From a paper:
A paradigmatic example for a drug target with a transient binding pocket is the FK506 binding protein 51 ([name]), encoded by the [name] gene. [name] is an intracellular protein belonging to the immunophilin family. Like many other members of the FKBPs family, it has a peptidyl-prolyl isomerase (PPIase) activity, can act as a co-chaperone of heat shock protein 90 (Hsp90) and it plays a role in the regulation of steroid hormone receptor activity. In humans, [name] is linked to several stress-related disorders (e.g., anxiety disorders or depression), obesity, type 2 diabetes, and chronic pain.
The iFit ligand class (including its analogs SAFit-FL and [name]) were the first molecules capable of selectively inhibiting [name]. The binding of these ligands stabilizes a conformational change in the [name] [name] domain. As the [name] variant showed the strongest improvements in the binding affinity of both [name]-selective ligands and its role in the formation of the transient binding pocket is not obvious, we decided to explore the molecular basis for the binding affinity enhancement in more detail. With a Kd of 0.09 ± 0.01 nM for SAFit-FL (out/in) and 0.7 ± 0.2 nM for Mcyc-TA (out/out), the affinity of this variant showed a 10- and 34-fold increase, respectively, while no improvement of ligand binding was seen for the canonical inhibitor FK-TA (in/in) 3. In the [name]-[name]:[name] (out/in) complex the loop involving serine 64 is slightly shifted and S64 engages in a hydrogen bond with K60. For the binding of SAFit-FL (out/in) only a serine substitution on position 64 shows a strong improvement in binding affinity. Strikingly, in the [name]-bound state S64 forms a hydrogen bond with the side chain of lysine 60, which seems not to be possible for the other G64 variants. Taken together, our results for the [name]-G64 variants strongly suggest that the improvement of the binding affinity of our conformation-specific ligands is due to a combination of destabilization of unproductive protein conformations, augmented for very favorable cases by specific stabilization of the productive conformation, and not due to novel contacts with the ligand.
Residue numbers in the entry: 13 to 140
The structure:
């Protein structure tokens, strides 16, 4: 399924090349620009724990999910991965614990050493 496709064909977008964040572009976006650190980003997404025990559709549609890029408002994998997206792009991200909640997790929602998967659509981004 989608996570296995990212394992096998995904691009490693980590600085260390440790496969901690793997990406596939599922729908190509518009133009060439991608957001800079400090830009406000607007996304729709859905995500899950790799063991399929929790799923998040809070912003699948409904209200956009909004955060300032590269400011630690989200897990490290998102500041890395959303930054690589074009407006209108849809991407899949597969994320190891070191780029999400680590050995600590975020109990009881996120267990220790959880792998996460997301489908993310970048709607827009704007300068601070
Ligand atoms: C810099 O480090 C961190 C920053 C922020 C957090 C909190 C969780 C942080 O969650 C995340 O960064 C990732 C990626 C963005 C979407 C949410 N997300 C999650 O893991 C999801 C998540 C996690 C949550 O809490 C852990 C949520 O809050 C209850 C949550 O609410 C919608 C969603 C997971 C849910 C289970 C299935 C797997 C996904 C968060 C949650 C909700 C909104 C956020 O920013 C926008 C806003 O405030 O409107 C940020 C943890 C951080 O470190 C572990």
């Amino acid at each position: 399924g989608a996570p296995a496709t990212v394992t096998e064909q995904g691009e490693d977008i980590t600085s260390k090349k440790d496969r901690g964040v793997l990406k596939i572009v599922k729908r190509v976006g518009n133009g060439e620009e991608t957001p800079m650190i400090g830009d406000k980003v607007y996304v729709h997404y859905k995500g899950k724990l790799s063991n399929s025990k929790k799923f998040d559709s809070s912003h699948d549609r409904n209200e956009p999910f909004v955060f300032s890029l590269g400011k630690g408002q989200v897990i490290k994998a998102w500041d890395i991965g959303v930054a690589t997206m074009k407006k209108g792009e849809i991407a899949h991200l597969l994320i190891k614990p070191e780029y999400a909640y680590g050995s600590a997790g975020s109990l009881p929602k996120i267990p220790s050493n959880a792998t996460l998967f997301f489908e993310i659509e970048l709607l827009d981004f704007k300068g601070e």
